Each structure stands twice: as C-alpha cells, then as structure tokens.
Amino acid sequence: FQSMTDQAFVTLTTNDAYAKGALVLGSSLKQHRTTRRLVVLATPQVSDSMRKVLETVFDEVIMVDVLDSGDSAHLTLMKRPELGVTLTKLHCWSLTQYSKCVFMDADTLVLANIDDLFDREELSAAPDPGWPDCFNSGVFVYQPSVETYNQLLHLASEQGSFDGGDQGILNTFFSSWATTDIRKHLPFIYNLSSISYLPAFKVFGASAKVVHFLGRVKPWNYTYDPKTKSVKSMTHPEFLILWWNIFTTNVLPLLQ
Amino acid sequence: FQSMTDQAFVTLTTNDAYAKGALVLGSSLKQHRTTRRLVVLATPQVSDSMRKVLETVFDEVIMVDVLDSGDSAHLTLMKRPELGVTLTKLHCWSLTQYSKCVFMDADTLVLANIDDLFDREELSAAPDPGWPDCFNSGVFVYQPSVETYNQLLHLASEQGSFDGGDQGILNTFFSSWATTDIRKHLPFIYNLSSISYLPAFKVFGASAKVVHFLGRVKPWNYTYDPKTKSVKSMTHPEFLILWWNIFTTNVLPLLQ
Numbered sequence A, B: 001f002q003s004m005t006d007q008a009f010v011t012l013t014t015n016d017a018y019a020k021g022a023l024v025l026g027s028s029l030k031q032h033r034t035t036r037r038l039v040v041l042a043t044p045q046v047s048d049s050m051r052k053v054l055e056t057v058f059d060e061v062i063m064v065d066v067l068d069s070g071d072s073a074h075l076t077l078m079k080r081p082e083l084g085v086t087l088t089k090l091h092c093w094s095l096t097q098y099s100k101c102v103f104m105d106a107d108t109l110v111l112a113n114i115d116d117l118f119d120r121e122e123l124s125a126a127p128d129p130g131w132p133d134c135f136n137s138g139v140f141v142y143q144p145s146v147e148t149y150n151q152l153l154h155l156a157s158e159q160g161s162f163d164g165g166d167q168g169i170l171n172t173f174f175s176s177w178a179t180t181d182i183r184k185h186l187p188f189i190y191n192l193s194s195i196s197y198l199p200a201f202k203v204f205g206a207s208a209k210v211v212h213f214l215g216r217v218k219p220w221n222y223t224y225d226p227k228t229k230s231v232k233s234m235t236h237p238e239f240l241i242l243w244w245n246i247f248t249t250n251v252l253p254l255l256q
C-alpha cells in the first residue's frame, strides 16, 4: 500500500480553485504508484464541502489558519500582512510526523513516479528559468523541523521576501544552493516550467517527470469542452489536456 | 602589462556588424584591466578595413575560413553545410598556444574584471535561462586541445546540433555539466541574459559582471542619437547605453 508512512508529498490550497489543482496533483501521484503519504495544507477559505473532496485523495487534510492568534506564524503576519499565503506554505516545515517531504505547488502535475526524490536532502530543488541561480520553490525536498520553521519565520519577519512570495524567502534562507553540492540541484525535468528554448524541449521534453503550470492562467481557469477533449484559448498542449483528463476521468468520480 | 600570455579571452566575428560587438567587448575587457590576451576569430566575410580596426584592440586577429579545403573543419562542413558559423566558433579549441581560455560571444559586454574565471576548469559555463540544465555557450572556460577539437567535429558530423548552432553540440559533448561538479556552474552574473524575473534582478543585478545581448536585435542594430545619449525602440536600459558609451567613446577614436 502507501506503506512509507515516514515520508510525504505536501501541497497547499488557499481556496477551492487551487483545491482542484491539489486534487489533480494527488491523483497523478497515485496514478504513478507512490508509496508515500499525501498531505494538503488547507486554509479556512477552502469550503467544508471541498475539504471533504480533498479527503478522498489526501491521507491528511491539515488546516492552517494564520489569522488565528494561536497559529505560530500569526505574529509574523502582523509584521508582514502581505505574506499570508507564504506564511501558510512555510507550515510545511511543521509536519514533524515525517522525516522528509517533497513539497509540490497545487499547479503541478506528476507524469512519472518521482519517489526517487526521497534520496535527496534538504534543500533540493530545480533551477528557476529566467533567474537560474535561484531555485524554483514549486517543488522541493525538505526535512520538517520546528527549528528550521522558526528560523524561516524570523527571516520573513526581519526582511520580508524579495519577490513578495515564498521563493524569495526560501532562496535567501537556503542561499548556498547555487554554489554548493550539485546533488541539491534537482534536474529541471522534476519541475518543468510550462513557459519553457523549444529545441531543448524537442530533445529532453519526453523525459519530463513533473510539469509546473506557472503564469497567471492556471489549468482550471480554462474552459474545457469534454466532447472535443480540448480547451478554449498551449505550446506543448499535451500537458493541459492531461490535466483535464485526470480531472474529468479520475477526480470527478471520487465524491459521487 | 597584458603579461599573462598563456591565457586568453576569445571571441568571433563573421561579419562587420558582429566585429563592432567584438570591438566593444575587447574594449570592455581592457577597461576592467585584464592581464590576459585578447583574441578574435575572424572570417573572410569581415572586410580588410575592419580587420585592421580589430587589430587596434585584439592581440591576435586569427583568420578562420571553413570554405577553405585546407581548413580542418571543411569536410565536416560538407556533411553539415548549415553549421558554418558553429564550425568556425569551434576553432577556439585549436588555439593551443594557450593553456586555458574564456570564450565570449561578440554580443557580450564586460562590466567588471572577470580574470577569476581562469581559476575554473573545462567546461565551466553558466546556466541558460529557459532550459537551465543546459549551459549557455555565450561565455565558457575551456582548454584548447586538438584532441577535443576533433572530437567536437566528430559529433557535429555524426549528429549535427540539436539547436542548429553551437550550444546544442557543446551541451551534448559536455553532457555531464548539469549533474557533476558545481564549480563548473559559473554564476549567472558571468553571463546575464538581457532577456532576464524582475525582482531577482532588483536584488542580484547590481553585481552583474557580464551582460549577454541575446535575441535578434543586437546593440549595434539600434539607432543611437549621440546628442541625447539614448536609442530608438530596454527593461534595464543602462546596459545598451553602456554599450553605446564604450563604442562612441573608446572604440571610435582607435583608427582615426
């Protein structure tokens, strides 16, 4: 079964739109036979009915509310009120019931088994296109730790994020990534930006393991015509079609 | 003086337009006090008058003609007639009068002394934006070798270049770059693509050492109004203005 209880894939949904992503992401991990646990961090902005749909896919639906005065990140939010989503995402480090996790954004899709990511150590991530001496925070291998979590809150508090989101803050904290230990550089096929050199895709693209739907318009923002199995608007369109295939075929029949 | 005779910066001009780039690049290297030699590979498509202007900046203007039946790359050109420019560029490995060189495209500009690149070993290059598990071939540290040169011609012959240019072929040959030895990953500030995440530039951009004017429209294709010291059309415009400053101020007075 999903017998590797000490390790997990972890995602985040702040609303019902992103929950659809999480549902496709979780489904895709199970379709490729992960033995690890599946965890989604959900905010109270996700509806009760959606939370129950998430429980049909994830082993743990964990509520995170940074607006709660009892939440560990709440005092940081009062200093940095623009960082609500980021501070929520950072709660991934609080999941100390696991020795090692791979965080994945809810706008990612798994195309092959990536259980080999658990061979990696904190902080392993793939390079960001556009500024490749920063890693992209859509997919990363980390070790839950209260110490680490509080150090991240400390940084967020004192300096904010240089990009207003989590990537800036994680790159600043884990600032040795670009120059130390090549094994912490995940291959780009573990976090393949849908924005990404066409001739490079032509030769390396078939080996993609994870696609990351970056940019404003997410897969669930597309109007899908199920009849034609297409969308209305897509450089390598197979991925968006795959997303909608998983959603209509594997996600929809789960709450009945 | 330029007393480090065993090592060189090497560029390439296939015509008079690109020669203007080479002139600004060479000037910029001397303005930042390189102790290394400056070499430009020139084709016969560069005019005699331009070749003499190049001699005012470069220590060696070396003619390369792949159309010559006596050129080492000529038989490869007959197999791969679309690769003339690439095969010319590959002649950088023939410069065995030097133990180590940094190749730089004529569409690059140096902003600080980068003599520390000679601490690096073959093949050291920075990641390409867009496909960051490939290195960008605009700037790279290499060791001239006839053996290596002929192995590159062998590859070009048998497989061409996956991108129709030199980057594909150099990435295929030096295919361990992405996964082996982080010291072969030049920091992105040694080959900063003018196309490149705005908030990353805002915090890391001031430390840029070399800018690479990628894309179709090169700095010399701009109409510069010297009066206003501007151009007609530029996200971080300082670089293009710097290019034209070096050209009008330091390049033009050199042949008189």
Ligand SMILES: [Mn+2]
Residues within 6 Å of the ligand: A105, A106, A107, A108, A138, A212, A213, A214
């Ligand atoms: Mn994302």
Ligand SMILES: [Mn+2]
Residues within 6 Å of the ligand: B105, B106, B107, B108, B138, B212, B213, B214
């Ligand atoms: Mn170039």
